[PDB]
């Protein structure tokens, strides 16, 4: 029913990894990590690789600590407009 996460998410040792099949997909969805209030985390030290179309989000600065691991909140949507309610929100858990 609801949209499925457009990329591939992988919990790594020290970071969250989001992979896409092309740069077109990654720039189309433009994933960002947000806090409990839904604002993008500007102290997040993520890395972007457009050779392999991968986004890496370190747990410490980009995710929220909970019992057993981290919760990551991801927002995707169109970057060509200021219409924000068509964006999609996703929440994942990565065990420590």
């Amino acid at each position: 029913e609801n949209p499925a996460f457009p990329g591939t998410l992988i919990c790594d040792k020290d970071e969250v990894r989001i992979e896409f099949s092309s740069r077109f997909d990654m720039e189309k969805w433009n994933p960002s990590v947000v806090d409990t209030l839904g604002s993008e985390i500007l102290s997040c030290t993520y890395a972007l690789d457009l050779e392999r179309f991968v986004l890496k989000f370190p747990y410490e600065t980009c995710t929220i600590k909970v019992v057993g691991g981290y919760q990551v909140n991801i927002r995707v949507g169109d970057t060509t407009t200021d219409v924000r309610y068509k964006d999609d929100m996703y929440h994942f858990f990565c065990p420590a």
Epitope: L37, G38, S39, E40, T79, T81, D82, V83, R84, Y85, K86, D87, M89
Partner: antibody
Framework: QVQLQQSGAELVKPGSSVKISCKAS????????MHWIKQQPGNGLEWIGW????????KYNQKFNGKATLTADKSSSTVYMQLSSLTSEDSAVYFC?????????????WGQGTSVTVSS | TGDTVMTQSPSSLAVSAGETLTINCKSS????????????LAWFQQKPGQSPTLLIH???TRQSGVPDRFIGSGSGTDFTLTISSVQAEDLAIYYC?????????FGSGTKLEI
């Protein structure tokens, strides 16, 4: 110049269905969203869902899943909302509103409202 | 679950003529977009027997033809609508709305009676 003309009020028994039409004029029909809003008598406003007549993309409030169905006819520049299995909670005034995608989808233009009354 | 809750206060207001009232609306989620550096919040006025009317959008910007006595203000979580020198035609119910997220949500509303 922008006008939204909804169909007239309707009175039905519980369990029946109604289809509310909203005809848009004064702007490019497929370039904006159409929002539907429910106002119960003596109560506030509740957001049902939006439809984009361009590609017929839709988004619903999960509370209204299965209750409301949005469709759009580009030739007539008219958006339809179908309400089914009507109960007493479904008696309300229903507004269509244009989400202006230039300004973030904010709803500047509203229809006059359609009163749906469910009684047995 | 996941819905952005709009908490509007007070529920009702009773005032006279010429004084200035303030309506507060707080959101459970930030409505600020770093892209356009704006907060997604609208203020609506609905008189009895009429469709709602958009007063403020972007939480600070008045619609064309709206008197300057309506002042939208506030920050990502906290928003305020101030109506200076209230007039008889300002008698209505006022709603705050967030359009940053789907589902779009309203405040419970503020009844004004003079």
């Amino acid at each position: 110049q922008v006008q939204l003309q909804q169909s007239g009020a309707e009175l039905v028994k519980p369990g029946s269905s109604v289809k509310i039409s909203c005809k848009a004029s004064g702007y490019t029909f497929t370039s904006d969203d159409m929002h539907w809003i429910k106002q119960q008598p003596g109560n506030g406003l509740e957001w049902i869902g939006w439809i984009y007549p361009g590609n017929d993309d839709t988004k619903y409030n999960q509370k209204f899943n299965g209750k409301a169905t949005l469709t759009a006819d580009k030739s007539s520049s008219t958006v339809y909302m179908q309400l089914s299995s009507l109960t007493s909670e479904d008696s309300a005034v229903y507004f269509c509103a244009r989400g202006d995608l230039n300004y973030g989808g904010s709803m500047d233009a509203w229809g006059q409202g359609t009163s749906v009354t469910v009684s047995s | 679950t996941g819905d952005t809750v709009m908490t509007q206060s007070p529920s009702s207001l009773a005032v006279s003529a010429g004084e200035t009232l303030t309506i507060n609306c707080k959101s459970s989620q930030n409505l600020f977009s770093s892209r356009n550096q704006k907060n997604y919040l609208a203020w609506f006025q609905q008189k009895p027997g009429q469709s709602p009317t958009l007063l403020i959008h972007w939480a600070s910007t008045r619609q064309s033809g709206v008197p300057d006595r309506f002042i939208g203000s506030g920050s990502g979580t906290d928003f305020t609508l101030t109506i200076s020198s209230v007039q008889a035609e300002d008698l209505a119910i006022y709603y705050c709305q967030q359009y940053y997220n789907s589902p779009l949500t309203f405040g419970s509303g503020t009844k004004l009676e003079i």
